Design an enzyme around this catalytic site. Structure first.
Site, mmCIF file in Angstrom:
data_model
loop_
_atom_site.group_PDB
_atom_site.id
_atom_site.type_symbol
_atom_site.label_atom_id
_atom_site.label_comp_id
_atom_site.label_asym_id
_atom_site.label_seq_id
_atom_site.Cartn_x
_atom_site.Cartn_y
_atom_site.Cartn_z
ATOM 1 N N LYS A 108 -3.053 6.309 -10.418
ATOM 2 C CA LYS A 108 -1.895 5.974 -9.908
ATOM 3 C C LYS A 108 -1.372 4.654 -9.756
ATOM 4 C CE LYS A 108 -1.597 5.895 -5.139
ATOM 5 N NZ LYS A 108 -0.932 4.453 -5.086
ATOM 6 N N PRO A 128 -4.345 10.157 0.101
ATOM 7 C CA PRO A 128 -4.943 8.993 0.140
ATOM 8 C C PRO A 128 -5.572 8.573 1.193
ATOM 9 C CG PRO A 128 -2.567 8.755 0.591
ATOM 10 C CD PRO A 128 -2.922 10.220 0.340
ATOM 11 N N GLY A 129 -6.182 7.517 1.724
ATOM 12 C CA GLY A 129 -6.878 7.124 2.968
ATOM 13 C C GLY A 129 -8.323 7.853 3.010
ATOM 14 N N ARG A 176 -9.682 1.344 -3.364
ATOM 15 C CA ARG A 176 -10.979 0.196 -2.889
ATOM 16 C C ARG A 176 -12.445 0.660 -3.349
ATOM 17 N NH1 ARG A 176 -9.117 -2.619 2.911
ATOM 18 N NH2 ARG A 176 -9.310 -0.633 3.956
ATOM 19 N N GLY A 232 -11.627 8.275 3.898
ATOM 20 C CA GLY A 232 -12.899 7.311 4.350
ATOM 21 C C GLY A 232 -13.960 7.112 3.418
ATOM 22 N N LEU A 257 6.434 5.369 -6.592
ATOM 23 C CA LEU A 257 7.584 4.398 -6.408
ATOM 24 C C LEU A 257 8.434 4.836 -5.088
ATOM 25 C CD1 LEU A 257 9.039 4.624 -10.025
ATOM 26 C CD2 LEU A 257 7.238 3.191 -9.398
ATOM 27 N N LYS A 258 7.803 5.913 -4.667
ATOM 28 C CA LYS A 258 8.483 6.397 -3.325
ATOM 29 C C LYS A 258 10.221 6.204 -3.558
ATOM 30 C CE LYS A 258 4.660 5.732 -0.363
ATOM 31 N NZ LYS A 258 3.707 5.158 -1.373
ATOM 32 N N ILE A 269 20.050 6.535 -4.151
ATOM 33 C CA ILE A 269 21.119 7.582 -4.349
ATOM 34 C C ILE A 269 20.749 8.405 -5.760
ATOM 35 C CG2 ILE A 269 22.866 6.027 -3.449
ATOM 36 C CD1 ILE A 269 23.942 5.493 -6.210
ATOM 37 N N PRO A 270 21.221 9.572 -5.830
ATOM 38 C CA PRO A 270 20.983 10.372 -7.209
ATOM 39 C C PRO A 270 21.049 9.523 -8.467
ATOM 40 C CG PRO A 270 21.953 11.643 -5.538
ATOM 41 C CD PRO A 270 22.164 10.307 -5.203
#
Ligand SMILES: O=c1[nH]c(=O)c2[nH+]cn([C@@H]3O[C@H](COP(=O)(O)O)[C@@H](O)[C@H]3O)c2[nH]1
Ligand SMILES: O=c1[nH]c(=O)c2[nH+]cn([C@@H]3O[C@H](COP(=O)(O)O)[C@@H](O)[C@H]3O)c2[nH]1
Lengths: 208, 208
Positions: free
Chosen positions: A29, A162-163, A186, A165, A58-59, A63-64
């Protein structure tokens, strides 16, 4: 199935880490910082040096026609999936999906997420159910949330989390909770031995 | 005051056009496609070649740390303003604001905007009122909305409005309704003679 968050924004040092762990990961990613720092080319190349599919985090939230242009350029560069927000609407999501596989954002884990995004997660999940993207992101800091989403999300739509532990067992628990892919950054790229850390997470996941 | 929406994805062609109209524009807005095509350094070049401020229309919508990384790079590359979404929360907006001037999205004009963004416009305006960004974007295709937003927007926050020309909006109408800046793309960069087109809009806005 592991997704490496290559958040090591420095050139060649980022690619070195990814090629050596290629055996234990399913996708790589990349985000805007890496793209800005190395150019959209770091994509085509992260590929022909690891042989692993790539997710462009990229989130997209424009607009389209602009979402389309960005997608075409990023997919065109070799990305296999593009992460897009649900908030901006279905036409904007479909504009990207029409050119390649997408992963939709239905919930987020930062404090600000509770203000507008998370209160709408149930509604975003339903949009995801109608659009049927390849998958949706689900913060896995809390396995409870992965299961919550899994209970409401259509079978066939994957969950990437994601995230995760750092404690031993967390990665396994996130998968058990319903995550098809765990996104780790990480704990891998900043560990003494990357391949080893990758293998550990990999071995943990398959129960042995 | 004109903001040239430089949606010309060939860097040198963008510079060429920007230079030919530089004395009739106040700022230049660039989006991801141009940055992807020519590299983020195109912001520095456009600024050196034209002498006008640059707005990076990125519509940032990530977690605080990532929004900050992106903003640091883009402001560092010479951007004078960054457009950010309000829906991701106050922390994500502030993460960008702490590094440079911002413009907030409180309403959009594509069909998909009706699903989740627009129903929240009143609330987004109040969030902008608290944060006090340099400005917010307002729909130039519907001057009635510019005035609606202007009335509810804290005095001091500027309004920039796209939708003039190609989308059917009028510069004179948008300014009359309260727009501080008029954002124009195609009507200038696709004009047979861009400088002439830019002067005309410039004249229209001056004639009140
Ligand atoms: O969609 C998301 N919403 C979030 O709230 C979030 N928080 C962290 N991340 C991303 O998770 C990946 C791994 O993070 P770590 O470096 O902590 O392992 C990296 O790619 C991090 O950027 C998020 N992604
Ligand atoms: O809601 C919208 N529907 C649209 O069809 C549209 N087209 C362009 N844009 C945005 O406006 C900026 C300048 O557009 P123009 O080339 O039409 O002047 C462009 O740079 C975009 O930021 C749109 N916004």
């Amino acid at each position: 199935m592991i997704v490496l968050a290559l958040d090591v924004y420095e050139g060649e040092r980022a690619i070195k880490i990814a090629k050596s762990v290629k055996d234990y990961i399913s996708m790589i990613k990349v985000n805007w910082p890496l793209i800005l720092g190395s150019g959209v080319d770091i994509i085509r190349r992260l590929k022909e040096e690891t042989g692993v599919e790539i997710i462009a985090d990229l989130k997209l939230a424009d607009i389209p026609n602009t979402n389309r242009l960005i997608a075409r350029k990023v997919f065109g560069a070799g990305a296999d999936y593009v992460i897009v927000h649900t908030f901006v609407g279905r036409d904007s999501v479909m504009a990207v999906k029409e050119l390649g596989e997408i992963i939709m954002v239905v919930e987020m884990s930062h404090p600000g997420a509770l203000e507008f995004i998370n209160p709408l997660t149930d509604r975003f999940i339903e949009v995801a159910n109608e659009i049927e993207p390849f998958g949706v992101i689900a913060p896995g800091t809390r396995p409870e949330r992965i299961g919550y989403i899994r209970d409401r999300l259509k079978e066939g739509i994957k969950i990437l989390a994601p995230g995760i532990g750092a404690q031993g067992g967390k990665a396994k628990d996130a998968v058990k909770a319903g995550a098809d892919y765990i996104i780790v950054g990480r704990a891998i790229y900043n560990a003494p031995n990357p391949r080893e850390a990758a293998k550990a997470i990999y071995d943990e996941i398959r129960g042995v």
